[PDB]
Structure formats: C-alpha cells, structure tokens
Nucleic acid binder design. Structure first.
Lengths: 89, 50, 66, 111, 52, 108, 1030
RNA sequence: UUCCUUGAUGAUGUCAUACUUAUCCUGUCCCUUUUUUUUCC
C-alpha cells in the first residue's frame, strides 16, 4: 500500500514538510545527515513542488541522507518518492 | 524410528530407524566388515550402503 | 531485484549462475584497464582484438544451455 | 565496473546539446545540456533508453546540425542465444545497428 | 546412487543422507568441499526451531 | 412523501412452523392485493416468508400498522426487503418473444 | 428523533439525488481493406458490434508485428471458443495473401434493455399522442428471491379475496370495522444475536437466527459470517477475524465471498466506517486471489466505481488503489472484455464513472497496452455517446497519469483531434477539454504534438456562444505557456481581446476559466507591462473582486493566485494599492482574502517598492483587520508577520500603536483571543529587537512573565512561544526577567498534561538549558531531571524529540554518571515506560562526555536478571554506535563478548536487537582494521539466519548487509557458497536472499571470489583467462 | 534359568499474557462537478 516509485533519479532537490523534517528517508533516522536527495519531477511536480516526499504537505526543508545508507550505497537507487499504492494524488 | 530400512554391507541387515543406521557408521561390526573387507575404517566411507 | 540482473532465486540452475559470473568477469575485463592489458600481453593481440573477442564470448560462454 | 551501470561508453553531440552515456548492457541514459541564463553550463535531468538483454558494442555521437539528435547504439541481443538449446542462435544472429533519436519537444527517447 | 556418488569427491564424506536429495549433486558435491567455505548450520530437520 | 429504500417486497419473520397460508393471506390481505407470497420451506428458511403486493403504498400501510403485530404468542419482524443481490441465479432474458409481440400487435 | 440526533452524528448520507441511482444497481493490404469487409462479415455473423471490430483491425498499423496476443485479447471479448476459429483463419489468410503479393450474451441483454425503453417510451409517445411499480412475471419473481422458497396457494377462494382485495380495497376501505381489546404460561423467546445485529441487518445475517450443526458449502457460508465480526463488534474482534479471513482466502474462494459481501457493500444503510472496512476486506483478499476474480470483476466495479465519485478524498484514493489491484490483478483482456457495454449505457453516470475506471486500469497496465482499444472507441461510428465517453477517458487518463503522459502524447492527441470538428456538441466540448488537461500535464512540452490541433481551435474561439466557448479557452490558455513568444506573441495578442469581452459573464464555470487564463496570458514573459495596466486591471478589479467569489472555495484560491501574478509583473503598489481599502470591509472571508493576497505579494515582490502614504494605510489596515477575528486563523497572523518582516525598519514609527494593541488585546476580551496576540508577539520579536526598542523588551519580558500563571492551556502555550522567540533575540545575560527568576518559574509547569504547553515548555527549557545553563544552580537541574523523566509518556513524537535533546543539554551541564544512573532507573518490570526514548538518552548522554567513561556502568547493568531492561541495554549500544561512528574503533572489544552472550539465546529479542548493534558498529568502524573481532562475532550471528519472525529477519538482513561492508564480501561469500544449491527448499530460499544482498552491491568486486568450478560435457565453467601467465 | 512408571511431537481449537516498528494518535480537502449545445444593443 505504501512503497517506492523508484522512477529514475533526476536533479530535482527533495522536499520535506514540518513533520518528516529530520528524517533520513530510508534509514528513518535523524543521525548524521551528509548528502542530498534527488527525485524525478515525475514524482515531484506542480502541486508537488515543495511537497512532502511523505505526507502530502508543503516542504519546509530538504531531507538529508544518513551516512549509514551512504556506505551501503542505497541513495543511488530509484527516486525515493513514496507512492501510496493508490495514486500519488 | 520403527521405519523399515536395510544396510547392504552388514548381512543385508535390517534397521528400524535412520538415526540408528546413521549410528551404524561408527560400530564394531560395521568397521569389521569394512576393514576385513579391505576397505579401511573411519570417516571417508561413512555413507556406504552396498 | 528482478529488473536488477544477476538476481538469483532458489530455482537457479547451475548453468545460469555460472554464465552470469562469466559475463561479469567480462565487463570487469573491459573495465579495468590494466587487467585488460595483462591479457593483451600474454596472448599477443591488440587491445582491440581482445575486447572484440570478449564481446563475442559474452553470450556464449560455456556453450549452449541444457 | 558493472555489467549494467553506465559510464562505460560515452557519446555526445556535435552541437553539444545533449550527451548520451551507457553501460555495456541494458542501460543507456541521456543528459541534455543547455548553458544557463548567463551561458554557463546547466545540466538537464536524465532520461532512459532501456531495452532488455541487449549488448552495446559501441556508441558514437551522430551528426545532425540543429535537429532532434541521433545516436548509434551498436547492439546485439543474446536472448535468442539463451533459449536455443541447440547452439544455432549462437551463430546466425547478427548484431543490430539502431539509431536512437532524442526528441526535445516530447522529451523522451525513441528507438 | 548415493553409493557411487561417493567416489567422485575428494572428501566424499561430505555427502550426507538428504544430499542425493539434491537437485544438483553433480555440483553440490564439488562446492561443499570448497577450500575455505563454511558448512551450513545444523538446526533444521531438527524441528525444535533453534533453542531450548 | 416516501423513503426510497422500501419496496413492494417485505421480509416477514417470527413465524410458527405450523402456520397457514389461510391465516397469512387473510391478515396481510388488508392493505391490498397480493402479488404473491413465498414461505421458507427449507431447513434454514422454515420460519420466514416474503410478501409482495400489487402496489408499494399497499405495503407502506402494511409496515405502518402491522409493525410488530402479533400472531400466536409471537411478534412478527416486519421489514422492507432489500433487493438486487442473489437472483442472477435467473439470467436476464425472455425479451425476444415478448418485445416482438408489442412490436407486432400494436405495430409500435 | 434525538436518537436520530446522536445517531446521525454517527455517520451521515452525504449524497445528492443524482448519485442515488446507486440503489438501483442490480448485482452483475488493400485487401486489408476489402479484408475489413471480410472480418466485418464473419464476426458480424458470429449483430453490429463496432469497437470490437476496431480492436481487431486496430492491430494493423504495427504491420508485420501482430501476433498470438490478438487471440488473447479477442479471446476474451468474444467467447473464447469461436476465438481459435476466427483468429486462426485470419492468421492463415494474412500469411498467405502476405506471400502472394457469457459476454456476447451480456451485450445482447443491453440492446435488449434499450429496445425495451424504446417500446415503453414510444408507448407513452403514441399514448401521449393518445417505473419501479411495473408489474411482474413468475419467471422474473423466482430469480429475484434466492433459492429455497416455495410459492404458495392458500385457496382460489383465498387468492380470490386477494383478487378481490383491490376492488375490495376501495370497496372495503369504505365499509365497517374497528378493533376491541379484552381485559384478561407464555413461552417463545425470539433469538436476536456473537457480537451484535442491528435491526435492519437481520436480512443479511438471518441465518444466524438458526442454531444447528451438521448442515459442505453451506458450512462455508455459515462460517463466513465472520464478516459480522468485521462489520460490527470490538476492535480486537475486527482484527483477528480479519486475518482469519485473509488466510482463508484461497480456501473459500472468491465466489462465496463476494456473494456474501456485495450485498453489504451495497447496503442501503451502510456507514462510513463499515464501508471503508469492507473495502479493506476487498483489497486484502485481492492481494491474494489473482486468476480467481475473473468472473467477478465487473461484479466488483459496479460497487467500487461509485467510490471514485465521493466527497471524501481518502475515499477516492482507496478506490483507485483497489481498482488497480483488481485490474492488474485480473487480466487486461479481462478488464476490456468486461467493460465495453458500460460505455453506451444510457445513464451518463455509469459512463462517467466508467471512464475513471479505465483511467485507473490504464495507470495499471500502461497506456500503450490499452491504446488500440481507445483509438478504436473514438472512431466508433455507431453513436456518439461512446465517443463522449472515450474522449472523457482520455481526460481522466490525463489527470491521473499526469506528468508521465508524455511519450504517447502524440498518439493520444492523434485520437482526439477527430472530435473537435464533430457535428454533435458535447463531443466537441469534452474533447477540447481533454486537450487542456493534456497540456496541463505536458508542462512545458510537446508543443508541436498538440500542433495540428490549434488552427481549428483559434477559429472555433471566434464563433461561439457558451460553455464550450470558454472551454476552448481552458485549453488555449493552458497552451500558451507552451509556445514561442513570437508565435505565442501573435496568438496571445488575439486572445486577450475575447478574454476582455468575456470577463463579465454570469457563468461561474466561465469566471474560473477566464481567470486562470489571465494568469497565463498576462502571466507571460513576452507580454508588455503597460498594456495590462490599461485594458485589463480596471475591469479586473471591477467585476471579479466581489462577494460572490470569495465565499466559494476554489474561486477564492484561483483568484489569489491570479492577482498575485499580475503583481509579479506590473509591480506591487499597483495591486496592493487597489485592494488595501478592503481590509476594512466588514465580512470576514473577504478580508481574509485580501489579507492573504497581500501577504504573498509582499512575499514575492518585496516591500521595497511601496510608497509611504499607502503604507500608513497598510498598517492601519492590518491592525484593523487583525483586531477583529472570528476564529483564530493562521491567515491574518502570518499575513501580518510577513508584512512586518518585509517592511524592516520602515516599520519603526508604527510600533507604539502595535504594541499598544498587543497589550490591550492581550488582556481582556476574555482569553480566547489572548493566544492570538501572544503569537503576534511570537512572530514580531525580531522586529522589536534590531530597531532597538528596549522599553518594549522590558514590557514583553515581564508582562508575559506574569501570564505564565494563566490556567488555560491554549493561552499559556502561545505565551511561552512568545517567550522563546523573545529569547532568540535578546541574549541570556541581558534578559529582563533574568533567568534565575524564570527558569524555575517554568519548572513546575511540566505536569501540564495538555499538549501545546508541554511542547512550548520543553522547547523553552531546552533553549535555555543549552545556552545559558550556568545561571541555574545544579540542584534545580536535578529537580528538572526527575521531572523530565515522565515526559516520556508523550503520545506525540516532537515532545519526546526535543525532550531527549534537552536531557543531553543538562547532562552536559552536570556530568554523566548520575544522569545515566538516573536514566538507568527505568526498569524491565513495566516496559511502556523506558520503552526506548530513555535508551536514546543513554545514547546521546554517552556521547556528550566521553562514552569511554560510561560503558562499565552500562555493561555491568546488563547483569540484572530483569529481562526487558537487559534488552534495553542492548539497544543502548545500538543507538550508541550509530551516534558515535569512527570512535567505535575502541570500545568494540568491550561489547564483543557481551554481544556473544546476548546474541546467544535467551530469546529472540536478544538476538534481534543485539544483531542491530552489530549493524551500526559494522558500518561505523569501517576500514580502520578492527575486522578480526567482527569476523568472530559473525559466527554467533550467523545461525540466526533462519526464522519467520519478521522483526528478527529484517534485523538480520540489516546485520549481514553492514557486515558485508566491514568484513568485505570474500569472507561473506565464503559463508554463502554451500547454501545455494542445498537440496532443501528452505535453505535455498534464504542463502539466495543473502547472496543477492551481497550481490547487488560489490558485484564489481566479486569476480575474484567465485571459486574454480570444473567444466562438464556440454559446457566450460572454467574461466581460462586468469591463468594466462606471462 | 524366571521381571516394572515412562517420554515427546504434529494437527485442530477465537483461552491466556508478554512484546516488536523513533510505526500509529494529525494531518488532511485542489481539479467527482457529470445532462437532453443554448444568457438579451
């Protein structure tokens, strides 16, 4: 019901809301932000301009990835823009 | 246990369990059949039947 | 996982697994400049004829399936 | 060095517009380029050529001055070659020349 | 024959009962022997689910 | 001036298993002409019955007064029957003949 | 009725008259041309169906490429029997002349239905030249009732009175009667039963009025009333019952199920919740059954599709979710062969929805799968109603698939053009409308794909009256952004006229449209400033800005937007100048509107443009509004804040009037409005500072300080907030309530239970115990500690969040041992308490002085026999290493033996959490050379591999992944060889899952580590290269 | 040469109790807006 879109990784900076704000996206964690989020404008467009990469609210900041997911190199897979397995709106 | 089985090298003997037959591999008589047969003992020949 | 090639599953045949690691051996050999040059030296050819040959042997290696 | 991840072969247009990049197998991506407001080089977002089980021997920029650009992926399929128990498809396959065609306006890339 | 499947292996002892159950003994043999690798652990076929 | 859900059918329950079509037809007979009736004769549906009239407003007057009405020592559950559901045991059809008929006599 | 009062605030209907047909729904190669004469002939035999024939021939244009799949898709559409016959015959004639150079039943039932409506409607057409009450036949009656009922006769005298009933219903309606009671060992308790049955529901669950066993199918139905435990009862019942049905999926099979749901998902009286849940069952079982659902698919959508048309958003998104899950779940050709006949169904509703269905199934199976079908539809020549639909379909595809439409854009359009010219209107209308939606997803691109569309459009624009007209605008407008401002230049210059003449219409569909247009037309770079200033504005502000508009929702927004963009161009003072005067217009929603508009504008453009006099009118305004607030709403508040922070030191003359109101309001007016003014301070802090109005800072500091005794939460919250932001401007040692006073004054508040308090408080306490932190003697702190500790009952995340971070700040102030000793107090006997956030304290603490201190305390504390606190300490290590990283290169040794113990069983949980420790350690250390030990641990890890317990497993996957990077593959792979081919399934399942995870990363490394493998007869598995020796 | 009590599983049961995910407990309303074309200097 809730899983990744994993469409291709564009240049568009990620956008996170109030709620999600601290979280390294995949490791769920606040620890050690280092590097930066990219998603496809397909995932990120329009009403999604500055939209949460989780909940559907306006982005007030920019998710940083952990270092943990870094050395395991996951940040480079398909764009982590979570789709509810209904549509994305 | 109590399941029909047979060892061929020993007197075409019958064994009622697989744990027991797996214990036959280390035994006096089984090694006597091997060594007196000219097939030397211990651990390479464990899986023998015929 | 599936659309990422080289994925296995428990039904994986001997043959397929080995052909995989062949191919990957190759894209390494095309990759690592030196390793390549090594081959070239040993069996005397061009760099090229090497890479070419390899890219022939890509689909084949081991020969036909079973 | 992967089997599937680009960077191996690299090609780019005369007019510099866009640049195509490719692994050996399965992936060919394309980054488009245009100089910024101040004519400093800004990079597009990527695209994808994906085609399954296809070997790319070699890729080369193409010439069309101010068109939708072209590229030459020298290819071969091995998929015939697997599902031939015999070893006939081992022979009697020919490597397939294909020109891919960027298309700006539509912004995808079509065989 | 789990018999004559046993004369092809340097350490044929590594063949075990469920082994010729193997889909690919002709291989599994040649692997499981391999230089430094580690045996698969023993707890399954013991149905007691690892600790008591 | 009516709720849409109610229909010419009523589900009717809290019946005895002796009970008579004579009683039934009479009692229900008040409000209007009976389209017809069914009685559950089966291991489960022994005890219940369906009732259907030539008009709804018939039935409306029914569920109105017969609400919780008594028979024997029992109180009858009196409900507007649902619909749709499991019927399609009977396939839609039987047009062709008939609609040719209206096609014919009246010519229309 | 009062029960009809408190029961109606349970649930509620929500629906229109229009949507209530729902109740009515009863359940479930020039010889390629002359060839088309052939195909048409043969199928026409096997009458008249159009878009079938077109889905057939629609495989032409890929020529040479059409295959077996033709038999698939067509196989469903016609009866798969005739299928082979035809498509076989075709493939023959095609290969050759290539050289020499129930469904059917269903539609039959439709053409039936409308033939009938023709008969009746005509009968009152000549009868007018001369419904549910329609009389019935016994053939029909048997079908409606389920199985298992006798019809009766009581008597032909009985049924004669019945026959007499009507005639004697009027007759004996007027006759004698009245009824007389008489004043004067019972039994028979009726069983009405098992959580509970509403009265109405008896009809469904009636068979739970019988009490028996020994009946077999009927035992499956009679066991499927597990539903009722879904529909009604307690939450836990719902849960457990729910799974019990999930695993019983395969077993009972769909047929019985949906037979037993769809009545309920059709229930005239259904709730919200009950609906939503019964959806949940439909999804969940639809994660399982795949091939199964086929005969049921239409028999599903009929319920679901109405979900698409719902006021509730979350409703919709569920709906879409399951219509995919079905459509993908079933087969494509299933979906199609299913869903034609709803296209021409008389009701526009069912079409409409039917589209949105096809939208979804298309998101599932991709456009190009489905195209030749559509493209067939829009060329259906039987009737338009289809085409109206098929086009709609294009649209809702547009909306859903959105930004991704891009590639087949050209094809889609190549459908839809042939509409615009049509004789029928709607088809024009809807068509164009689609083009719009397309472009709105095509942003910005594919311009020339739309290309051949225009030249009609522009012409069409001229000649129109009506809804269609403005529609064509809706398009063009969304085009213009896509053109070249030279070509776009021209064409723009034409439109802005018609736009002008059309501001004025009464139509609201209109005003939305023309509005959004202006956003785009004059929303352009290649349009000239003055020109807008003259022609447009004065109308614009005239007809639009009116009270009609803002009361409505959308128009409100769309408006704000538009006006904003006219600012982004013609400047600021222009707009704002004209709408200032309306802050003082009375009615709220209006004011709210002007207010937010301005807020944005001075958001984007900047204050710097604004003159002076106008400005007086601002602040006078923005107070006058702010002084009267129906609710407390973020709008006016933010809108203000931005106003000030934009004006900067232009603001300064105005304070006294502000802070004057700020206080005055602040008091009285009774408390509801208080929190507002409080916030107002919150946001304007910064402005009170840099300008250096300190008397102001005396005022605020102290007078806020008094309220902190206010008892209402919703004031005190905002109060503190103000305090916090007050602190962020004026430093500690200049604080006018100098901290010594303050910080304790806070301290007792922490009980406050209510939310907003706990938030702003712990926030505050945090800032201050971070920054100053010396001001307050230690003793006070340790009181703070022992008060914090139970803030960890917070339902909320954020509280605990900052809570922890504070716990750290003070832990710095004092020094560690105690504060963990104090944290160490949480125990295994309870659990919920010290669940983990406490552990997170142990972590952060353990950093903020050298952890190199703290361990021995911790480690030793794993001795304690109380189980759950044991595992607690394990996680402590977990977060601990996650937070330390490199430093682990030391204490690793310390833990390693402990990890050995915990990792060896007591219970799972030990192994789970501990293993996690292995993870974060294994990353952190990376490549400093401490592997050896980590190898050692790998052992005691390893056996854990096997289990079903989801947390244990995804834990372990965690472990071995990290361990890979630490140890390197080669070692790993040396645990994973033997596993691959192990005869059993169980092992192979896993060792494969591992070897994958090893495999994806570091695939490049491996090559070395595949061992030598002896080549067999047909093949060579030895890679000879590596042995070339110079 | 003439002799004791016992262990254990697996399957089916809506009993019982601990526990796991920085899960969850607040976000959230926005293109459902659908009709036989029909708004007059």
């Amino acid at each position: 019901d809730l899983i990744f879109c994993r469409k291709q990784a564009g240049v568009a900076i990620g956008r996170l809301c109030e709620k999600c704000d601290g979280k390294c996206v995949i490791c769920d964690s606040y620890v050690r932000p280092c590097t930066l989020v990219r998603i496809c404008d397909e995932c990120n467009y329009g009403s999604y301009q500055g939209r949460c990469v989780i909940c559907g609210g306006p982005g007030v900041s920019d998710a940083y990835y952990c270092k943990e997911c870094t050395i395991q190199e996951k940040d480079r897979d398909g764009c982590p823009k979570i789709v509810n397995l209904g549509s994305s709106k | 246990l109590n399941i029909n089985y047979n060892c061929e090298i020993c007197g075409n003997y019958t064994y009622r369990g697989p744990k027991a037959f797996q214990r036959h591999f280390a035994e006096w008589r089984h090694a006597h059949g091997m060594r007196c047969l000219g097939i030397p003992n211990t651990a390479h020949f464990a899986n023998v039947t015929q | 996982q599936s659309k990422y090639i080289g994925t296995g599953h428990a039904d994986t045949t001997k043959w397929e697994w080995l052909v995989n690691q062949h191919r990957d051996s190759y894209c390494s050999y095309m990759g690592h400049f030196d390793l390549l040059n090594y081959f070239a030296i040993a069996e005397n050819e061009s760099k090229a004829r090497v890479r070419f040959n390899l890219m022939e042997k890509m689909l084949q290696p081991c020969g036909p399936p079973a | 060095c992967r089997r599937i991840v680009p960077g191996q072969f690299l090609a780019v247009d005369p007019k510099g517009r866009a640049v195509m990049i490719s692994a050996i197998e399965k992936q060919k991506l394309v980054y488009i380029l245009n100089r910024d407001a101040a004519a400093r080089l800004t990079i597009s977002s990527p695209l994808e050529a994906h085609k399954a089980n296809t070997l790319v021997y070699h890729v080369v920029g193409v010439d069309v001055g101010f068109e939708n650009p072209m590229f030459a992926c020298l290819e071969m399929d091995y998929e015939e070659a697997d599902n031939d128990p015999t070893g006939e498809a081992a022979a009697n396959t020919q490597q397939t020349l294909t020109f891919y065609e960027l298309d700006l306006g539509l912004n995808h890339v079509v065989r | 024959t789990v018999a004559e499947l046993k004369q092809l292996v340097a350490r044929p002892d590594v063949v075990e009962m469920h082994d010729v159950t193997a889909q690919d003994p002709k291989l599994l043999v040649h692997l499981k022997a391999t230089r430094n690798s580690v045996p698969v652990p023993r707890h399954w076929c013991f149905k007691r689910k690892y600790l008591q | 001036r009516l709720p849409p859900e109610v229909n010419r059918i009523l589900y009717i329950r809290n019946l005895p298993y002796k009970i008579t079509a004579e009683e039934m037809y009479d009692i229900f007979g008040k409000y209007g002409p009976i389209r017809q009736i069914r009685v559950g004769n089966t291991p489960e549906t022994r005890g219940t019955a369906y009732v259907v009239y030539e008009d709804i407003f018939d039935a409306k007057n029914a569920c109105d007064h017969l609400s919780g009405f008594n028979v024997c020592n029992r109180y009858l559950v009196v409900l507007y029957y649902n619909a749709n559901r499991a019927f399609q045991k009977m396939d839609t059809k039987k047009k062709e003949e008939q609609l040719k008929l209206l096609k014919e006599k009246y010519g229309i | 009725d009062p029960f009809a009062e408190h029961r109606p605030p349970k649930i509620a209907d929500r629906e229109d008259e229009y949507k209530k047909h729902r109740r009515t729904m009863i359940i479930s190669a020039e010889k390629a041309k002359a060839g088309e004469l052939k195909v048409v002939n043969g199928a026409a035999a096997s009458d008249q169906t159009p878009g079938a024939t077109p889905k057939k021939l629609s495989s032409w244009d890929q020529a040479e490429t059409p295959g077996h799949t033709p038999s698939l898709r067509w196989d469903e559409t016609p009866g798969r029997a005739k299928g082979s016959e035809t498509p076989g015959a075709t493939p023959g004639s095609k290969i050759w002349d290539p050289t020499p150079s129930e469904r059917d039943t269903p539609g039959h039932g439709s053409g039936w239905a409308e033939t009938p409506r023709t008969d009746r409607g005509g009968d009152s057409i000549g009868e007018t030249p001369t419904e549910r009450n329609r009389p019935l036949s016994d053939e029909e009656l048997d079908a409606m009732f389920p199985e298992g009922y006798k019809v009766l006769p009581p008597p032909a005298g009985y049924v004669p009175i019945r026959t007499p009933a009507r005639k004697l219903t009027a007759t004996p309606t007027p006759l004698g009667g009245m009824t007389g009671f008489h004043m004067q060992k019972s039994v028979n308790d009726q069983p009405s039963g098992l959580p509970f049955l509403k009265p109405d529901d008896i009809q469904y669950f009636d068979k739970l009025l019988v009490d028996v066993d020994e009946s077999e199918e009927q035992k499956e139905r009679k066991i499927m009333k597990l539903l009722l435990k879904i529909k009604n009862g307690t939450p836990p019942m719902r849960k457990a019952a729910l799974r019990q049905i999930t695993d019983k999926a395969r077993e009972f099979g769909a047929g019985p199920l949906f037979n037993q749901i769809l009545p309920l998902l059709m229930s005239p009286t259904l709730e919200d919740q009950e609906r939503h849940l019964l959806v949940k069952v439909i999804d969940r079982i639809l994660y399982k059954l795949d091939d199964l659902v086929r005969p049921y698919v239409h028999k599903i959508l009929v319920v679901i599709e109405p979900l698409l048309i719902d006021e509730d958003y979350y409703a919709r998104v569920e709906g879409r979710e399951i219509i995919s899950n079905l459509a993908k779940a079933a087969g494509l050709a299933t979906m199609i062969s299913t869903m034609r006949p709803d296209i021409d169904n008389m009701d526009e509703y069912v079409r409409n929805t039917t589209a949105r269905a096809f939208a979804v199934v298309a998101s599932a199976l991709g456009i190009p799968s489905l195209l030749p079908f559509l493209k067939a539809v829009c060329k259906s020549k039987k009737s338009w109603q289809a085409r109206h639909t098929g086009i709609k379909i294009v649209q809702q595809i547009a909306i859903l698939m959105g930004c991704a439409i891009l590639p087949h854009l050209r094809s889609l359009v190549e459908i839809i053009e042939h509409g615009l010219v049509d004789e029928q209107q709607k088809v024009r209308t809807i068509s164009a409308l689609a083009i719009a939606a397309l472009a709105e997803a095509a942003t910005p691109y594919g311009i020339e794909s739309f290309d051949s569309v225009l030249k009609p459009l522009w012409k069409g624009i001229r000649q129109h009256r009506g809804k269609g007209l403005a529609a064509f605008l809706k398009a063009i407008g969304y085009l213009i952004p896509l053109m070249d401002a030279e070509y776009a230049n021209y064409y723009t210059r034409e439109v802005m006229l018609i736009l002008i003449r059309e501001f004025q219409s009464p139509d609201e569909e209109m005003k939305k449209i023309v509005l959004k247009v202006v956003k785009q037309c004059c929303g352009t770079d290649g349009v000239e400033a003055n020109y807008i200033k003259t022609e447009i504005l004065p109308p614009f502000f005239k007809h639009f800005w009116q009270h009609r508009m803002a009361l409505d929702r959308r128009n409100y927004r769309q408006l704000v937007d538009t006006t904003v963009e006219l600012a982004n161009k013609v400047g600021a003072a222009e707009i704002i100048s004209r709408i200032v005067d309306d802050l003082k217009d009375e009615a709220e929603q209006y004011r709210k509107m002007v207010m937010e508009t301005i807020e944005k504008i001075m958001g984007n453009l900047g204050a710097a443009d604004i003159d002076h006099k106008l400005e007086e009118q601002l602040i006078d305004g923005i107070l006058y509004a702010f002084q009267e607030q129906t609710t407390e709403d973020s709008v006016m508040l933010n809108g203000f804040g931005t106003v000030v922070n934009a004006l900067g030191k232009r603001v300064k003359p105005y304070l006294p009037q502000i802070c004057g109101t700020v206080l005055w309001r602040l008091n009285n007016k009774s408390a509801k409005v208080r929190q507002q003014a409080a916030d107002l301070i919150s946001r304007t802090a910064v402005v009170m500072k840099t300008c250096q109005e300190e008397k102001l800072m005396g005022h605020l500091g102290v007078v806020l300080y008094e309220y902190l005794g206010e008892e209402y939460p919703e004031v005190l919250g905002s109060i503190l907030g103000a305090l916090k932001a007050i602190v962020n401007v004026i430093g500690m040692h200049k604080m006018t309530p100098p901290i010594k006073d303050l910080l304790p004054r806070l301290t007792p508040i922490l009980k406050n239970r209510h939310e907003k308090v706990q938030e702003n408080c712990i926030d505050l306490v945090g800032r201050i115990a971070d920054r100053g932190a010396e001001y307050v003697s230690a003793r006070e702190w340790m009181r703070i500690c022992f008060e914090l500790l139970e803030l960890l009952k917070a339902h909320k995340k954020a509280i605990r969040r900052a809570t922890v971070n504070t716990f750290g700040y003070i832990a710095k102030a004092i020094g560690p041992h105690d504060v963990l000793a104090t944290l160490l107090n949480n125990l295994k006997v309870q659990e919920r308490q010290n669940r983990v956030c406490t552990t997170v304290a142990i972590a952060i603490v353990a950093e903020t002085c050298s952890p190199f201190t703290v361990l021995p305390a911790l480690m030793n504390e794993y001795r304690v026999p109380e189980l759950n606190v044991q595992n607690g300490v394990l996680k402590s290590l977990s977060f601990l290493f996650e937070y330390i990283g490199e430093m682990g290169k030391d204490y690793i040794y310390a833990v390693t033996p402990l990890l050995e113990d915990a990792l060896m069983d007591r219970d799972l949980v030990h192994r789970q959490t501990a293993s996690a420790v292995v993870q974060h350690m294994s990353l952190g250390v990376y490549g400093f050379g401490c592997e050896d030990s980590l190898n050692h641990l790998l052992n005691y890890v390893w056996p854990n591999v096997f289990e079903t317990s989801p947390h244990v497993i995804q834990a372990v996957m965690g472990a071995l992944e990290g361990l890979r990077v630490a140890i390197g593959p080669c070692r790993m792979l040396q645990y994973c060889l033997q596993g691959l081919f192990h005869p059993a399934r169980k092992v192979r399942d896993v060792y494969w899952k591992i070897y994958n995870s090893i495999y994806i990363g570091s695939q490049d490394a491996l090559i070395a580590h595949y061992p030598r493998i002896y080549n067999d007869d047909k093949n060579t598995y030895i890679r000879y290269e590596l042995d070339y020796i110079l």
